Amino acid sequence: RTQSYTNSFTRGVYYPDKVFRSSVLHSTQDLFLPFFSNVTWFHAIHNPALPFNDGVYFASTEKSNIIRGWIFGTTLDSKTQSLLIVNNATNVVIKVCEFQFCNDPFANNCTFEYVSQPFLMKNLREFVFKNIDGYFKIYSKHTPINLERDLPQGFSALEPLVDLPIGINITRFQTLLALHAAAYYVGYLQPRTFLLKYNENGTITDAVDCALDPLSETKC
Amino acid sequence: TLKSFTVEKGIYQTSNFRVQPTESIVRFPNITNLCPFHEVFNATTFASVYAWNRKRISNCVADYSVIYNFAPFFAFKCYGVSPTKLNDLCFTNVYADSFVIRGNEVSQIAPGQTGNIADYNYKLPDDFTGCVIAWNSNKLDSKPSGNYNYLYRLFRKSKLKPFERDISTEIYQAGNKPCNGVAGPNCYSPLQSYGFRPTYGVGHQPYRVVVLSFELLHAPATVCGPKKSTNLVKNKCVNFNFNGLTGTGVLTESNKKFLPFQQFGRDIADTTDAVRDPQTLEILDITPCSFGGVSVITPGTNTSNQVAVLYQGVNCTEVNVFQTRAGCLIGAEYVNNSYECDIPIGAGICASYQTQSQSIIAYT
Amino acid sequence: MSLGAENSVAYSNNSIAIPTNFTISVTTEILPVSMTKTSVDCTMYICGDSTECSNLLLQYGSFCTQLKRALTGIAVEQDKNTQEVFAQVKQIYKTPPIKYFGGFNFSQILPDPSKPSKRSFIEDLLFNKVTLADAGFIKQYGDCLGDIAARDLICAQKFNGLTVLPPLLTDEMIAQYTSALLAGTITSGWTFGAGAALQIPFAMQMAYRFNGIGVTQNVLYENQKLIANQFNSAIGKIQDSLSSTASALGKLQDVVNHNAQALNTLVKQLSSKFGAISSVLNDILSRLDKVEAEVQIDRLITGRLQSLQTYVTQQLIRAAEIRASANLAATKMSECVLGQSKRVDF
Amino acid sequence: STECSNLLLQYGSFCTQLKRALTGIAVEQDKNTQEVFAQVKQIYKTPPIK
Amino acid sequence: AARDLICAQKFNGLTVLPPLLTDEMIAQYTSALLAGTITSGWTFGAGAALQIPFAMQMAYRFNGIGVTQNVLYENQKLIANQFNSAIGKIQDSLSSTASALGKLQDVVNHNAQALNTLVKQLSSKFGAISSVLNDILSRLDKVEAEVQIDRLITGRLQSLQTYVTQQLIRAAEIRASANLAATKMSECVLGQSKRVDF
Ligand SMILES: *[C@@H]1O[C@H](CO)[C@@H](O[C@@H]2O[C@H](CO)[C@@H](O)[C@H](O)[C@H]2NC(C)=O)[C@H](O)[C@H]1NC(C)=O
Ligand SMILES: *[C@@H]1O[C@H](CO)[C@@H](O)[C@H](O)[C@H]1NC(C)=O
Ligand SMILES: *[C@@H]1O[C@H](CO)[C@@H](O)[C@H](O)[C@H]1NC(C)=O
Ligand SMILES: *[C@@H]1O[C@H](CO)[C@@H](O)[C@H](O)[C@H]1NC(C)=O
Ligand SMILES: *[C@@H]1O[C@H](CO)[C@@H](O)[C@H](O)[C@H]1NC(C)=O
Ligand SMILES: *[C@@H]1O[C@H](CO)[C@@H](O)[C@H](O)[C@H]1NC(C)=O
Ligand SMILES: *[C@@H]1O[C@H](CO)[C@@H](O)[C@H](O)[C@H]1NC(C)=O
Ligand SMILES: *[C@@H]1O[C@H](CO)[C@@H](O)[C@H](O)[C@H]1NC(C)=O
């Protein structure tokens, strides 16, 4: 495949909890994507996998709707449990049980199932996957991007979507491909302290890092 | 409040007034099913330590008074909550973890402990809010030839994350020479059997352990204990029990744009400002009931026993009434004169004990 | 940093330097006098209508009684400071209807009856420039009950038992005191501060003021129009300086900001756990039995009591500083306004 | 110590107001020295004849 | 060899900041004030500095206190000798007697000893089992070391709050003294004062 590099451009902030806060500045320490970091761009025209390190961050600008899955795990071929989804116009059902995957995918508990609206609704698909204390957390948010060149400017907070009850230790992950091309951005989370700004409607409109440059430390 | 039988001429701040609540409201989500503690606490066998079984208890009504009848244990030892208060408040989800350990190793099932179970078999988080139950199984899990159906793991390369399960069966190597699948020199099996016998001492008897882990209210609550609901009323000073949150205040219909994943709204001083009703999806605003300090304006007890009451900083429709800028004055008559200040009250208003029958008057 | 421009004054044993002309200069000295009067209710702040916390609070002695005594002493002291500074005149003097004081234009400092609150132009500029924090001495509880948009900081201060008492003297009464002092200064001179007021023309009063500082009185009478024009241009320069520069009134803005941030810190200290399991008393009282909740409530009571004692101590030290400044302002009112001062740089 | 810092974080904002008090004293000392000594606009010099 | 007092103060987080004005700048300010007082008189404190002979300035200083100015001009050498002898007496008194500067030394000494106490209070136990934090972490498990750490944190916070309150009170006293010194510099150096015993 093809590997390139991109700056983050202050994107990847989310709601830290499920409490409504309005017109306040809140300082939270959590696994966040640091501002102006190195995000690896992957073009999948050709597939070895990627290491999982304290959660990841996925971005996609694919208008053609050819991304229909995320695969997690440790060894990726049976044994330990590997997440697998099916995305179409009908269901978003979750498969945790083993299948004995191949090299190019184009006996435990926690067999989650979920029938709901499709995840994939000039569009930006953002995702955050993290794992703390056996709890697996998913975050997602649509973004109607107009200037389709790179990761755009602004602050789009990510809605918390799915929390799993329990999971196995995860060190590796893959990405599905659709054939009858694909490009995704991968970033890595780090434990950081953020200062989030809430407007009168309770939405996160701005955020200041506390470890980027000394002006931001002074603002924190 | 002055600890004296005579007071002097002046204004004294005595206490505060507060409208008492008149009704009690308990709002719980509508739910019919009962939680199956009988399957957890009464089973023909329990899983091993290295492969502990977790059951997700949700969408039911949890009664904790039947746990004592199900199993003959001594102490319902908890860490974040109290055993007697578990039928009042309620949680989001319950997780029951069941295993059988040795009697010498029951003290390792606690937050912030090390050892052998707490390092390689079953590790609890430091912020653990839940209860641990252990009871004897000498008549169910002990054989005179040795019970060999229970295994524990003691050899591992690293520590264990909290609530991490490991069922891998690989031959442990503690040297440079590889085992290559043969348990030869410096090659060990990480799983060993307990070998329970009834002739052992009381410290080596098998104890069945069930760990009930609760998680706090951050989602819509779907498992709750038995409490009767009450019809909701608004614009009244009431006591409320919203999913275990007990408080006093008035509930108002509010236009707050709650996101669909959010359930609560907090203030600057970490006080709950807005709630979501559990039965119907409505947003309610909590405001504390009407209050204010009370000042007593009097001359000396040597002069008279008459007093005037200043209600501080209230437009007093919620108690001679005179509305000043520093509250309202009851018991003093306003006059259209101007004397020097005798007893100061507020923004340009002074009170004095004058004839013009003697009475307490207020003026500018 | 540069200490200043280098100068080498030419000194000799038979050489002197004598001025031939003068300037009339109007400066501005801004002095704090009083600060915000606050009152704290311990039962609502530490406990908040919790009966168990009230039962464990009466076993701590008489800490809140002496805290309320200290805050009441500060609140009385602020009104005493304002009365000591401003209420030095015994009557209320009024300027004559004819506005001719030798050519000196006092139209910008004397009040006008068009507006309801009788304040002058410069007083209006000084009142508009120092923005207030809008403390809850006005009866704001009707607005606090009917909450709109997000909750304000003042409503959160009021709901935790932290209130602000209004001062005894309103701004109209201070304006009346200032107008009486100005009328007695420009119609009588220094005689109204040492007995009855004695009328005198303003040109003769300025001749007395020049004769006080060693300059003979014929200098004024031969240069009256120039001195009047210099005074009027100085008043125009000071209204333009107050209209342009907003950093001159930093002392009163600091007085407002310190008493705002002390109450903000006192409110924000309620979220701290202080070593307990939660910062909310009802969650502790519901999640625990009697003894464990008693221990956690004891921890929270000790932490909140320590924070309140720190607030009261810092308020006492600030009150001492404000009282020293108010005594200095009272001395400056007694000496600069009610008479002429021979002290250098006073 | 990391554990001591984590338990100190629960005690609130005492250190912020203590640092604010010490910073206020520190700037007040320089204000005192400036208002005592810096009372002249120009730095004069004595003539060479004494 | 032995650890110094300043090193032990600095190793625990107590840092002494330098003043903004160096002693050369204070000496230049004092030299400017002395040159303006000797040459000009009181005229440099109320506008532009105007030169005057020192004998005529001293004649006006005599005329201020009610002595006719011919007294100076008929007794100029005697007054000059008396001033020179008084300056030499001040020189000898400062060279021999050292207890006259006991105020400023106290301003040093308190600001030493308070910091010294703030070091000594690190040795106290405050009801715990040890004053060393690493021994508490080494000997004890999670909850018990949390209790001991909470006791030590409460004790150290109480001692540090006491230090800050004492520093605030001393700052108020020093500010009052500095206001008095500023008034004396404005009224004695820059003019002639009619206030008695001032
Ligand atoms: C003393 O100074 C004043 C200014 O403060 C001089 O007044 C100015 O005189 C000039 C003469 O050409 C006029 O153009 C200005 O308008 C005057 N200024 C003001 C404010 O009136 C005055 O002339 C000086 N005295 C002497 C003797 O020169
Ligand atoms: C990201 O890392 C690569 C590694 O070689 C580097 O070349 C590139 O400049 C980095 N991107 C930045 C610093 O924006
Ligand atoms: C809050 O929402 C309203 C309605 O959508 C909108 O008019 C307003 O601009 C929003 N406020 C913001 C974005 O600060
Ligand atoms: C609970 O109440 C809501 C609204 O009152 C209703 O829509 C829902 O069907 C009820 N559920 C049950 C199980 O009764
Ligand atoms: C446990 O379950 C068995 C099987 O149904 C039953 O016979 C027994 O009475 C149960 N014991 C208790 C204490 O519920
Ligand atoms: C609140 O007090 C003001 C004071 O004059 C009064 O005008 C107003 O009517 C009051 N509001 C009420 C009674 O609702
Ligand atoms: C006066 O000044 C001149 C010039 O410096 C000098 O020569 C003369 O000696 C001085 N007079 C006396 C008496 O010293
Ligand atoms: C000066 O006095 C006159 C009265 O004759 C007045 O009209 C004018 O406004 C005054 N000047 C200013 C700047 O107020």
Tab-separated table of C-alpha atoms and ligand atoms in Angstrom, chain C residues 12-14, chain D residues 49, ligand 7:
chain	number	residue	atom	x	y	z
C	12	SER	CA	28.182	78.126	40.239
C	13	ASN	CA	28.920	80.223	43.314
C	14	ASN	CA	27.367	83.403	41.862
D	49	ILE	CA	34.067	71.639	41.346
F	7	LIG	C1	33.831	80.866	43.062
F	7	LIG	O1	33.876	80.153	41.797
F	7	LIG	C2	35.044	80.397	40.997
F	7	LIG	C3	34.860	79.641	39.705
F	7	LIG	O2	34.786	78.241	39.931
F	7	LIG	C4	36.281	79.964	41.772
F	7	LIG	O3	37.448	80.211	40.996
F	7	LIG	C5	36.348	80.726	43.088
F	7	LIG	O4	37.473	80.288	43.837
F	7	LIG	C6	35.070	80.511	43.900
F	7	LIG	N1	35.107	81.285	45.129
F	7	LIG	C7	35.582	80.798	46.280
F	7	LIG	C8	35.554	81.736	47.452
F	7	LIG	O5	36.020	79.656	46.372
